[PDB]
Target: 26S proteasome non-ATPase regulatory subunit 11
Amino acid sequence: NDEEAVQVKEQSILELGSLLAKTGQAAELGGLLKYVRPFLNSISKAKAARLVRSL
Model:
């Protein structure tokens, strides 16, 4: 279903954000929170707020 695609997409956001945190990227990782702005509206505010606090 779509929930699994959102789950693997979120773990791909933690994965790509982890690799960008390992490579020492600042503008890309800082702009990723602005890039995932429309994606956070497709799910609840709990996982969105937890992702904003995590990143």
